[PDB]
Amino acid sequence: GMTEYKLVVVGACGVGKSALTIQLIQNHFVDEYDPTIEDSYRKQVVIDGETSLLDILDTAGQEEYSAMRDQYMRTGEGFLLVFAINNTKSFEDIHHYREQIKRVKDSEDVPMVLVGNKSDLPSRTVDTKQAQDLARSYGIPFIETSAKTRQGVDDAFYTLVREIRKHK
Ligand X SMILES: Nc1nc2c(ncn2[C@@H]2O[C@H](COP(=O)(O)OP(=O)(O)O)[C@@H](O)[C@H]2O)c(=O)[nH]1
Ligand Y SMILES: *CCC(=O)N1CCN2c3ncnc4cc(-c5c(C)ccc6n[nH]cc56)c(Cl)c(c34)OC[C@@H]2C1
Which of ligand X, Mg ion, ligand Y, none has residue 159 at its interface (CB below 5 to 8 Å by kind)? none
Residue 131 near ligand X by CB under 6 A: no
H/E run at residue 40:
strand 39-47
Closest by CA position to 9, among listed 151, 168, 148, 157 = 157
Q: Is there a contact between 76 and 112 (Cβ–Cβ < 8 Å)?
A: no
**Does residue 60 touch Mg ion according to CB under 5 A?**
yes
By CB under 6 A, tell whether 117 contacts ligand X: yes
How are beta strands 3-11 and 50-58 bridged, if at all? Answer: parallel
Query: What is the signed CA dihedral for 159, 17, 108, 125, rounded to 10 degrees?
Result: 90
Which one of residues 66, 128, 130, 149 is an interface residue with ligand Y (CB under 6 A)? 66
With CB under 6 A as the contact rule, the residue among 7, 19, 73, 131 that binds ligand X is 19
Confirm or reject binding of residue 65 to ligand Y (CB under 6 A): yes
Q: Whole-number minimum distance, CB 138 to ligand X, in Å?
A: 20
In sequence order, the 6+-apart residues with CB closer than 8 A to the CB of 161 are 5, 7, 47, 52, 54, 78
Element (H, E) at 93: helix 88-105
Q: Among ligand X, Mg ion, ligand Y, none, what binds residue 101 when CB lies within 5 to 8 Å by partner kind?
A: ligand Y
Scanning 35-43, 45-53, 91-99, 141-149 for contacts with Mg ion by CB under 5 A, the matching segment is 35-43
- Closer residue to ligand X in complex, CB, 86/132: 86
- According to DSSP, residue 47 is labeled E
Query: Is residue 61 a contact residue for ligand Y (CB under 6 A)?
Result: yes
Q: In the complex, which residues of this chain contact ligand X (CB under 6 A)? A: 11, 13-19, 30-33, 35, 117-118, 120-121, 146-148
